[PDB]
């Protein structure tokens with residue numbers, strides 16, 4: 669049957685890697701995040717790659733106000749990346765920013781992995797990170813990122829070019845957002 673947006677965006681994420689285009693994106697920047705989002709969602713959402721002007725919330729959590737989101741992003745992208753701790757802190761702030769109307773989770777996990785790969789030569793082996801544990805670590809992270817740090821640290825891999833880790837990790841990442 670016709671592909672859904674989630675199904676086609678999953679195909680687009682696989683192609684981002686298969687084509688090599690993944691390694692031609694800026695790492696750790698707002699623009700690089702926009703490039704990922706545009707790759708995943710171009711042709712699917714009208715706002716692919718575009719910083720939102722509206723507010724958004726999920727449960728009782730409101731993401732950064734659109735009113736100062738651009739300003740927040742400039743500071744976020746300048747955060748340092750030389751240790752695991754620093755990289756997770758930068759990711760936590762980019763998650764709080766949540767700069768698109770949709771597609772933040774999936775795009776920003778790819779963004780995180782590129783920062784880890786550049787600076788540590790590791791990525792997250794997402795297939796082994798349970799949805800429940802991931803979502804509760806993320807819910808705690810604005811106040812206390814320790815649970816998230818340890819969860820992700822225990823699931824790092826140095827096998828950053830392995831197809832199965834990459835493709836199963838895309839699958840898992842999309843499953844965090846409800847798609848299987």
Ligand SMILES: [Cl-]
Nearest residue numbers: 730731732733
């Ligand atoms: Cl806030």
Ligand SMILES: [Cl-]
Nearest residue numbers: 747754757758
């Ligand atoms: Cl910090």
Ligand SMILES: [Cl-]
Nearest residue numbers: 771772773774
């Ligand atoms: Cl998402």
